[PDB]
Amino acid sequence: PTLLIRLQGPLQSWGTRSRFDHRDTWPYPTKSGVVGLLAAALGRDRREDVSDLAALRMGVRVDRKGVLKVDYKRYFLSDAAFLVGLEGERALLEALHRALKNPRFPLYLGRKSYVPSPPPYLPDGLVEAPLAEALEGYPYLLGGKPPEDLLLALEAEEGRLVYDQPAGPFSERRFAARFVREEVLPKERVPEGPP
Numbered sequence: 047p048t049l050l051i052r053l054q055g056p057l058q059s060w061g062t063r064s065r066f067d068h069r070d071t072w073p074y075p076t077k078s079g080v081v082g083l084l085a086a087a088l089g090r091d092r093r094e095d096v097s098d099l100a101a102l103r104m105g106v107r108v109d110r111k112g113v114l115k116v117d118y119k120r121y122f123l124s125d126a127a128f129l130v131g132l133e134g135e136r137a138l139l140e141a142l143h144r145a146l147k148n149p150r151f152p153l154y155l156g157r158k159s160y161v162p163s164p165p166p167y168l169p170d171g172l173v174e175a176p177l178a179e180a181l182e183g184y185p186y187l188l189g190g191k192p193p194e195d196l197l198l199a200l201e202a203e204e205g206r207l208v209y210d211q212p213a214g215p216f217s218e219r220r221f222a223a224r225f226v227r228e229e230v231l232p233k234e235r236v237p238e239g240p241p
Contacts, residue, residue: 048180049139050171051080051146052187052241053128054109055163057117059156063221064209069120071156074106074199075128076210078221079156083166084132084142085216089150092217100212102134105177107231108197109187122156127187133177143172168241177201182231186239195230202227 053075060072060079072079081099090096112126132139146153146167154160173180178200186192205227214220 047136047139047174048131048133048172048177049142050168050173050180050184051130051132051166052164052168052171053080053130053155053162053166054126054187055155055161056125057155057157057160058112058123058126058128059121059160060123061156062208062210063219064223065219068157071114071121071123072208072210073111073114073123074108074126074197075130076208077104077201077224078210078212080104080130080132081212082216083153084145086151086153087142087145087149089145093215095215096212098135098138102132102138103177103201105131105133105181105198105200107131107181107184108199109192111197120157122160129181129184129187131177131181133180139172170241182235183237185237185241187241189240191238192233192236195233196236198229198231200227200229201225 060076062076107129110127112123115124202225205225207223209223211222211224213222
């Protein structure tokens with residue numbers, strides 16, 4: 047029902063495309079960034095259609111915000127940890143689940159050489175629940191319970207616009223606006239981690 051992935055590492059960078067400067071970063075993973083990673087895992091050529099991936103409904107749980115720093119110019123998120131969920135058609139999610147375990151192309155957290163640690167694959171990440179519940183109920187990515195309430199950023203029908211919805215093959219760089227709603231997730235909801 048919902049595929050969960052971990053985006054965690056010493057360095058990450060995420061771009062929207064109301065066109066975005068490659069030297070900037072969004073505060074948490076973007077739909078375009080995540081779909082790019084999914085496509086890499088599947089081994090898709092950049093010219094290939096990604097409408098099936100774009101149709102997935104995405105949510106982000108910010109387990110650890112990480113600190114905004116400069117890489118030498120280039121902004122990045124230091125030591126951030128994100129849980130990302132994707133809800134949609136089962137066969138595709140299962141294919142993605144397998145692809146993430148053994149990615150056909152290297153997975154990077156934004157800029158090539160930002161290596162994930164731990165890897166994005168979560169062995170128990172394919173949850174039979176809709177997006178919000180899947181994200182709410184997954185164990186904290188770091189040890190213990192979250193010490194404070196978490197940010198949850200959900201694809202929605204209303205809210206704030208972000209131009210990160212892949213609307214054609216990545217080679218064309220065609221993106222549309224989607225609404226993302228930011229909510230506060232009570233810390234008591236999240237089971238004790240790590241996964």
